[PDB]
Amino acid sequence: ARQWQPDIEWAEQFSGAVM
Amino acid sequence: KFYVREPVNAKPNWLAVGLSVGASVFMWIYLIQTHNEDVLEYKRRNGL
Amino acid sequence: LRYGLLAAILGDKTTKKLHEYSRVITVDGNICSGKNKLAKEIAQQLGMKHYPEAGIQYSSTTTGDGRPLDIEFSGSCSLEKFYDDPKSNDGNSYRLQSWLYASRLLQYADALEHLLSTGQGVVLERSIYSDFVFLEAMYNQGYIRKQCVDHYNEIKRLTLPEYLPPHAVIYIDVPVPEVQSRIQKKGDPHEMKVTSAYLQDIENAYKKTFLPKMSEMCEVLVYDSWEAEDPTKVVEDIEYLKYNKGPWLKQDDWTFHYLRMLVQDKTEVLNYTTIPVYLPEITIGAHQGSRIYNSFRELPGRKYAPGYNAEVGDKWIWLK
Amino acid sequence: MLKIILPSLMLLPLTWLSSPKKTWTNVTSYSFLISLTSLTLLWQTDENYKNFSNMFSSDPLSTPLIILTAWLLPLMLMASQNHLKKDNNVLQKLYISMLISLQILLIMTFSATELIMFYILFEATLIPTLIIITRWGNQTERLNAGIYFLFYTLIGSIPLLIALILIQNHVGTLNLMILSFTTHTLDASWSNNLLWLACMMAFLIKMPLYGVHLWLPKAHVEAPIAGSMILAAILLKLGSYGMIRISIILDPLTKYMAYPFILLSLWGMIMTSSICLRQTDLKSLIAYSSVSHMALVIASIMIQTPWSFMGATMLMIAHGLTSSLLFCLANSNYERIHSRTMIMARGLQMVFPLMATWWLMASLANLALPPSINLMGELFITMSLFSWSNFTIILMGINIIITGMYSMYMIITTQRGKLTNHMINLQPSHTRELTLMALHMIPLILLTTSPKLITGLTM
Amino acid sequence: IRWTYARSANIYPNFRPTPKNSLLGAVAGFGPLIFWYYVFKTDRDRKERLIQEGKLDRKFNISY
Amino acid sequence: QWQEDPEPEDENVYAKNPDFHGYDSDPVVDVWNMRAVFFFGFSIVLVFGTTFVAYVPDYRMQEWARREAERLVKYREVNGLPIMESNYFDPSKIQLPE
Amino acid sequence: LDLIWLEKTIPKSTSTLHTNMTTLTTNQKGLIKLYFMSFLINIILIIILYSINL
Amino acid sequence: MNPITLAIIYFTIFLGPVITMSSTNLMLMWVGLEFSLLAIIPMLINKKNPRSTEAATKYFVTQATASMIILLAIVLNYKQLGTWMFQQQTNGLILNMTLMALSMKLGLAPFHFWLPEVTQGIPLHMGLILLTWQKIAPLSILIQIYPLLNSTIILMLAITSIFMGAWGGLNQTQMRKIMAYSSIAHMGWMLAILPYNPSLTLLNLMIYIILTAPMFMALMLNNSMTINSISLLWNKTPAMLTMISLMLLSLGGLPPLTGFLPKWIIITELMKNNCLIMATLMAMMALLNLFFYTRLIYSTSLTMFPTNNNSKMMTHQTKTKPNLMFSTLAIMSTMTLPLAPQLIT
Ligand SMILES: CCCCCCCCCCCCO[C@@H]1O[C@H](CO)[C@@H](O[C@H]2O[C@H](CO)[C@@H](O)[C@H](O)[C@H]2O)[C@H](O)[C@H]1O
């Protein structure tokens, strides 16, 4: 295995107007 | 040369270096003189 | 003394430097329409600096040692792979286009900073104002997605308005049947696979969007090929333009000052091309991204800021 | 202590100024030589504790813990060396720095002479530890484990800060000797009941007490190896060390305020032990094993008898070495198949006969085989808990039976049966992996020959 | 992988409180804890009662 | 999809170096790292650390207190005194509430 | 117990409560008209509070 | 703007607080509050777009209304006592109206709804000025009358500000709002301890300023307004992650960082006065700050968010920022707890 590092889906949760 | 665009820090800023070192020497010499003038003043005011 | 407010207040002002040939000229046209030759003789005749068309490696050759970098450090895109497979699902096409806009945007700032700091004029082959013609061609042929076009228009909207436009635009009109022939007699095996329907779309964007858009702010010169084949004829057409429109009329010392602070700060120039909008075409995972970043920093002269690299013979580090 | 602390502060410049090919050798060589110097603390020929200054001082409770911390640093460096081989140089030196920083704070935490100084150091350990679990953890869940670890501690620790300030605003000082020799009996008013919980919940969360323990199985299951080693061996014992230190000033409210927590520990330990029977993840099975051992430590401290303290101190040191040995062993498989499932790899004794011996000895320490100090703790905690009340033997009898099952079930499942022959990547055990186990087990055997060194304050 | 994930990371998302769960957790949670409280409290009250009236034989007991 | 490295493969640590000890990929750095752990770990700490702990004398007065208890159990038996008094502090010095 | 009810009661309900509050008090319409209208309520409450303490 | 305008406008911005701070008379203190209000306005609205114009408008009508209320207090007091300074004999209601107006000027909740929005519509460097230098003038007035302030009003405002600042900041993906709510929460701490020990309000202000200054400077390095923008720092200025993380933990009050000292000493001094309940809630809601500061640390230094292709050009280029002040303020704002006894007194 390899260390999990954030993907596109993970980062899109900080992309909105609010959290 | 190596860089196509010559670096801003191509050579030392001798003005800053001498000024940078100058202040440091001055502050240590002033600091040390001040300390002795305080230990003498401290002793003299207190009978030691 | 790096340019700044104190440099301007002590005398470094642009309006003194400008003369009649302190102009930005952009030579436009289709593929193999003679821009290279014409742009090189406009600059030589008028005493202007020539900027060859910004390519994949434009920013490799303006920094460091000026030598091309491995393609992973320089955009991870291939013009040759665009012509071999324009619809590959590895996102090459829009990666190539997005990278080309950024490099053009940087060359424009390099060109403008030269203009405003010395007064010498510049000639550029294409620019950030004509760059979109290639993008529109890709989308019409299905080579990129609609989301890629949105991401391009977003970056353009955040970077293009910051800058002054060219004084003059020198379009060279070459019909596709002649263009398609020139590409064939050029030689490059990959560039010969270009579809003529793609070339036409480059020509339609030019005449239906670029030229009407620029005539509202720039002196536009359209030359058929035979008119352009004698560059001296074109330069005599440039010596007598009046330049009576566009933003350059309303510029003073302190409008130039703040434009010069923008274009000398290359991270400020490129800032908005890197916005965190997650198109799979251009997004890079941390693993690949960190591998590349670390390999790049082990390159000769790239490990530390320019002037502090002992490998490439820098001196007096302990005093800089 | 400044001769144990200052040389340890020098492993940080030594980490950064060493060559890329010398960092791991140099630091791990000098870590051993620092754990040798900490043995000077053991030179206690009298009944007076060692007071080195107004800041630091060592007791028979803080000396075993201090030494266990210093000895664990070289162990964790060797544990972290093979899963960091693919990182660039600055990441390794940044990992080594976070481990050293955790050893420096931990030593200062056990040697501090004042409660406020204990609290700050006791809170500073969250930073290097949060960085370790999150930056170097493996799964996506490491982000939720850092939050659970950070805010269980902090929520418990804010009331403790309040209570410590009230103690000083009333007594004038937080020095542990002065508070010992001037302690006044507390009234049984409803305000002191809350002062008691304020002073205790911080440490009862870190143990952890049953109920508020869900941070531990989350933290362990996702920390890198050296994250689990320090967590299971020292950071849990911050709770125990704190409760012993501060419970002197809380009398007589511990005679009744402790009932809810003796009951959560005694019942809670059965709940956690029985979990280890049905736990599908090997690293998770050990983490619940820790929760059920600390239950006895909580229960024995709450009754404040010379035997109960003596058993808890022995069990603190014994659990420190044993749980760490188990995590290292589970890691050794994990660094081969990159799976934590306990049933995935089986029959490993066929190809790792020596590593299967360490498994057996770790497992026998966990189920407290006489004469190991694991039993001495369990046995002296039982003796005291029996005198406290005679029906606690019912619950400790059960927990002892369950503790045998999940210890051997752990060994039978992974080391016996047929080999899972598709695992062609079962490389022979490294010399490094075997040294790591010998370093855990030899001290544990030596401490059994000289139990006097870990009897604590009462004995 | 599916089995181990179904039995850990996927339990809570698929848990909905109901009357039978809530009663079961309430009884499972505090049921045993209340039971033992009265066993120990009752025992130690009988022990503290018998030390005030001296009716205990702590004859050779000197460790606790 | 997005640009991303493929997952690195399953390497055999013994393939190239059959005497790999577990510490380093470079054989020479690798053996000296094993040697250091064994020397400072086993020859120095465990041996001398164990010795230094075996010769700490009179540890916590476990030895003095026995030597002293024998002195007291003798002195008190010959002089007819009780082996150990019920009260610790002399009742003379304790002024009780009236 | 551990996987469900001990999560639900402590860590999960604490995160639910505070997410609930940060949602109520952060969804403001951005209208200065409404802000001053609340600033008006605040002022009256201070007047009332001080009034009943004379 | 040309150098004459900057010299005039930046001098006036500096002049205001110095007039308020050096003035014995209340009308001259009010005058300094006007200088700051007037001269900041052109700075805020310099970029001239729909958002900075709304920001400069919301700011003007808020701060002008608060100014008129302060002036009413200064004038009702001159009617009552024939003097231009607040006395022990000043009417109680005169003091409370001054407090509410000044808190409206500081941004203390519940008079806070303007601050996060104004900070959002303006450039980063003017957010730095607005969230730092602009707080000294209203605070210097308050510290001059701390024997008179009603503590019940002050503690309700501080408790509100610590709660609203925590809850507000928990929901924000815009960095400039995270800084405004950070400010609101810290002003709660400065204000809670004001009527008891005004020296601790100056310690908490100074430590907040030297933490908030480099944090803005860090965001001004790449002009990063979002959590996703700041997540690219590992591929843009990775040298910055070590000190961004500590400053964020330091802003969070975590030991053993300098930012623990202000909360710890305020709590200590609050309980010297028997302010147990308020102190406990304050410390318990300061925990919520650390959560959304931790979430930021997760996105930047403890993980690597996906990066984009065009960021490779960014690396070929050379930056001339940050300056020598960022490093000086970063170290002092994090590694100065061992000097705590020299900071409190
Ligand atoms: C969820 C978090 C829980 C918070 C826990 C905090 C710890 C609890 C502390 C005990 C409760 C407060 O303890 C309080 O101490 C103060 C002084 O310190 C005393 O209280 C009293 O103090 C003095 C007299 O001493 C009086 O003038 C005053 O009016 C009154 O407050 C009482 O002793 C008790 O009311």
Ligand SMILES: CCCCCCCCCCCCO[C@@H]1O[C@H](CO)[C@@H](O[C@H]2O[C@H](CO)[C@@H](O)[C@H](O)[C@H]2O)[C@H](O)[C@H]1O
């Ligand atoms: C007696 C004193 C003890 C008090 C202890 C209180 C500790 C408080 C811990 C705060 C926990 C915050 O918990 C926060 O929200 C939930 C908790 O399920 C986690 O979130 C997780 O579960 C939720 C379900 O609700 C999912 O939406 C999410 O995808 C998943 O990651 C967050 O990743 C964590 O950040």
Ligand SMILES: CCCCCCCCCCCCO[C@@H]1O[C@H](CO)[C@@H](O[C@H]2O[C@H](CO)[C@@H](O)[C@H](O)[C@H]2O)[C@H](O)[C@H]1O
């Ligand atoms: C007095 C203070 C004591 C409490 C201390 C504060 C601890 C923090 C608790 C509040 C914050 C946790 O808040 C928790 O955030 C998680 C983050 O996943 C939210 O969960 C969210 O996860 C992801 C990303 O955020 C979203 O895609 C999802 O839809 C949503 O559920 C939870 O709905 C909320 O419960």
Ligand SMILES: CCCCCCCCCCCCO[C@@H]1O[C@H](CO)[C@@H](O[C@H]2O[C@H](CO)[C@@H](O)[C@H](O)[C@H]2O)[C@H](O)[C@H]1O
């Ligand atoms: C920044 C603080 C430090 C500086 C301290 C203040 C002293 C500054 C001295 C340098 C002054 C230069 O400021 C000078 O301003 C004038 C207006 O006044 C500008 O001049 C402006 O007005 C003139 C009027 O004839 C026109 O040409 C035109 O509208 C415009 O250029 C100059 O372009 C600038 O050179």
Ligand SMILES: CCCCCCCCCCCCO[C@@H]1O[C@H](CO)[C@@H](O[C@H]2O[C@H](CO)[C@@H](O)[C@H](O)[C@H]2O)[C@H](O)[C@H]1O
């Ligand atoms: C006694 C008198 C006291 C005088 C006090 C002076 C305080 C120092 C003021 C420093 C002001 C300079 O700080 C400010 O820098 C920022 C960059 O961060 C510039 O701001 C810039 O923002 C972005 C990108 O950064 C650009 O698109 C914009 O056009 C430009 O304004 C401002 O043009 C400059 O004004």
Ligand SMILES: CCCCCCCCCCCCO[C@@H]1O[C@H](CO)[C@@H](O[C@H]2O[C@H](CO)[C@@H](O)[C@H](O)[C@H]2O)[C@H](O)[C@H]1O
């Ligand atoms: C109380 C104990 C002390 C606590 C000290 C806090 C230490 C800082 C913790 C936050 C983490 C620092 O953040 C860390 O930054 C370094 C370089 O700065 C990054 O380092 C890595 O990435 C960057 C580029 O991406 C490279 O320059 C570097 O060589 C590489 O190893 C790590 O990926 C990141 O995790």
Ligand SMILES: Nc1nc2c(ncn2[C@@H]2O[C@H](COP(=O)(O)OP(=O)(O)OP(=O)(O)O)[C@@H](O)[C@H]2O)c(=O)[nH]1
């Ligand atoms: N997709 C894409 N291709 C581009 C872009 N700019 C240049 N190219 C390609 O890169 C090559 C650049 O050469 P050109 O300058 O356009 O044509 P030429 O052969 O050099 O002829 P002249 O320059 O006019 O003298 C062409 O083959 C173009 O297809 C672009 O913005 N997008």
Ligand SMILES: [Mg+2]
């Ligand atoms: Mg070309």
